[PDB]
Structure 1
Amino acid sequence: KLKVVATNSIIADITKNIAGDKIDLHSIVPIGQDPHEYEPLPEDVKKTSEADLIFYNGINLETGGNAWFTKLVENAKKTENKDYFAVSDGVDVIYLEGQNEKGKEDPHAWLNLENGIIFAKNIAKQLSAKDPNNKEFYEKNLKEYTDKLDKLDKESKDKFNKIPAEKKLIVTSEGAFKYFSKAYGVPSAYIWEINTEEEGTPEQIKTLVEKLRQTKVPSLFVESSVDDRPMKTVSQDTNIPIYAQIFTDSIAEQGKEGDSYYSMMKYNLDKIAEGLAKGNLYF
């Protein structure tokens, strides 16, 4: 079997849907954990060295202090675009908004299903190149998976139209919803823009608190892969409840709701619409 390493559970799940049992797949970043800053275990180091194919996010996910993925593949002596591939190649990138983050990409492409499709295309392409005997199989799985993703994408374009302007704002800890906001027509706000920066300072919380206390936003959200303390402080200081845990940088654990890329997205879309519609009744 082809030996394949994926950096996080989101890329791993998409690869599973394309490759099934035809490969030997390993995922580095454990479920629920931050993929921005991770220190690979010796078993991850060993799997990476022996891999014929490595998939990572690219666009500024696994690169920061101090570029853990770069260190891993360099030490394992793997070549970019021969041994390891960014699944984000081709995505319409959104950049970070911060004053000093000039030219720096926002990595969270997958929260737009259109990019999920691109991820899958990239994976299928690379698997096929390395494992021609299974090309037809990979391509068929790609066709089915992308149609499933596409139909959910097309259905969800108007999912937030019903939310009045005053209530219409996604609030999470990390500013991980830029692509989601653009794909499904709903603004987002945050405590900190990206995980590599300081995560939940008094000043950040205060900044978001004063923004919120002059909105009618009915619900806050927290991500499965961050410490919830900052958002809980935001909750107390604004009197806006946290409605639900949502998924950004990881899928859910097996057996939980959202334990794949597709159900993660379905769940996010569902739960976010619920929280912003909170209080709505027929009679």
Structure 2
Amino acid sequence: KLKVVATNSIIADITKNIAGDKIDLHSIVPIGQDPHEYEPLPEDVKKTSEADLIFYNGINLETGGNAWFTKLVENAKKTENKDYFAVSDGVDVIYLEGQNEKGKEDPHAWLNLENGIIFAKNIAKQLSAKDPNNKEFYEKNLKEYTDKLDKLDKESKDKFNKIPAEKKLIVTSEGAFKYFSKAYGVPSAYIWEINTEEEGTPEQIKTLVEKLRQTKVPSLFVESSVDDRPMKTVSQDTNIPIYAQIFTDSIAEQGKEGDSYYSMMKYNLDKIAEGLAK
């Protein structure tokens, strides 16, 4: 079987939906762990050295700061666009502070379904190139999978489009939902920007509180992977309730709600639409 390594659980789950039991798949950053700041373990190092195909997010998710993925593939003597591929190739990239330059790419592309589809297409392309005997199987699975994502995308867009505009704002701790905002037409507000050193200071909290007091946003949200105390303070100061916890960069544990890329996105889109339509 083709040996495949995926850098995190979102990419791994999308790969499973295309490849099924045709491959030997290993994922590095486990479910619920931090895919930006991660230290690969010996099993990760060995699997990556042995891999036929390696899939990563790109757009600075795993290559910024400590650049763990760069170190991993360099020590494994693997080659870009031969052994490893960025599943985000072809996404319409958003840049931190709207400054178009290498290294300022916002990594959170998968939070709109059109990009999840791009991820799936890139995975299918490279699986088919390395394993031509299972090409028609991968293509069949791709068409089914992308139809499922497209259907959810269109339904979610219809829901957000019905919400009164004054109420449409996605408030989270970190500004990690800009791709969601772009696709679904729900502007973002947040406590701290991506790659902010100090997260949840009194000054950041006050700044957001004062912005929100001038809106009619009915609900706030909080990421399941962050310390919720800054968002709880914002909720207290604005009297706007936190409606739900939402996923950012991981699927849920196996058997739980949101335990696939599809289920994760369905949960997020449905909860954000619900919370805002109240």
SS state at 1:77 partner = coil
Matches of 2:101 and 2:233, distance apart in 1: 27
- In structure 1, the gaps of 5 or more residues are 279-283
Matches of 2:180 and 2:272, distance apart in 1: 11
Contact 2:212 2:238 in 1 (8 A): yes
Matches of 1:102 and 1:146, distance apart in 2: 29
SS state at 1:255 partner = coil
Asked if 1:150 is matched to 2:133, the reply is no
Instruction: Report deviation, 1:147.
Output: 1.1
The equivalent residue for 2:120 is: 120
Instruction: Report deviation, 1:161.
Output: 2.6
RMSD: 1.8
Instruction: Report deviation, 1:201.
Output: 2.3
Contact 2:4 2:25 in 1 (8 A): yes
Assess, with a 3 A threshold, how the Cα gap between structure 1 residues 73 and 187 changes in structure 2: closer, same or farther: same
Assess, with a 3 A threshold, how the Cα gap between structure 1 residues 100 and 112 changes in structure 2: closer, same or farther: closer
Contact 2:59 2:103 in 1 (8 A): no
Instruction: Report deviation, 1:189.
Output: 1.1
Deviations 1:205-258 (A, max 9, x none): 221111112222121111122222221222222222211111111111111111
Contact 2:60 2:103 in 1 (8 A): no
Matches of 1:87 and 1:102, distance apart in 2: 17
SS state at 2:24 partner = strand
Matches of 2:166 and 2:200, distance apart in 1: 25
Instruction: Report deviation, 1:108.
Output: 1.0
Instruction: Report deviation, 1:99.
Output: 7.9
Matches of 1:261 and 1:69, distance apart in 2: 22
Instruction: Report deviation, 1:268.
Output: 0.8
Q: How does 1:167-206 map to 2 (within 5 A)?
A: 167-195=167-195, 197-206=197-206
- TM-score, normalised on structure 2? 0.94
Matches of 1:19 and 1:226, distance apart in 2: 32
Deviations 1:108-156 (A, max 9, x none): 1111111111100100010111111111111110111111111221222
Instruction: Report deviation, 1:202.
Output: 2.4
Which one is further off, 227-236 or 11-20?
227-236
Contact 2:156 2:270 in 1 (8 A): no
Matches of 1:165 and 1:96, distance apart in 2: 25
Matches of 2:195 and 2:224, distance apart in 1: 13
Matches of 2:197 and 2:261, distance apart in 1: 26
Contact 1:65 1:196 in 2 (8 A): no
Deviations 1:161-186 (A, max 9, x none): 33223321100111111111111111
Which one is further off, 176-185 or 84-93?
176-185
- In structure 2, the gaps of 5 or more residues are none
Contact 1:4 1:54 in 2 (8 A): yes
- TM-score, normalised on structure 1? 0.93
Assess, with a 3 A threshold, how the Cα gap between structure 1 residues 196 and 52 changes in structure 2: closer, same or farther: farther
Deviations 1:246-283 (A, max 9, x none): 111111111111111111111111000111122xxxxx
Assess, with a 3 A threshold, how the Cα gap between structure 1 residues 86 and 271 changes in structure 2: closer, same or farther: same
Contact 1:36 1:195 in 2 (8 A): no
Instruction: Report deviation, 1:196.
Output: 5.9
Matches of 2:276 and 2:154, distance apart in 1: 21
Size of the alignment, in residue pairs?
A: 278
Deviations 1:15-62 (A, max 9, x none): 000001111111111211221111112211111111111100001111
Q: How does 1:209-248 map to 2 (within 5 A)?
A: 209-248=209-248
Which one is further off, 86-95 or 222-231?
222-231
Deviations 1:82-123 (A, max 9, x none): 111000001111111278988611111111111111100100
Q: Percent identity?
A: 100
SS state at 1:148 partner = helix
Matches of 1:237 and 1:40, distance apart in 2: 40
Assess, with a 3 A threshold, how the Cα gap between structure 1 residues 91 and 233 changes in structure 2: closer, same or farther: same
Matches of 2:224 and 2:28, distance apart in 1: 17
Which one is further off, 156-165 or 130-139?
156-165
Contact 1:37 1:196 in 2 (8 A): no
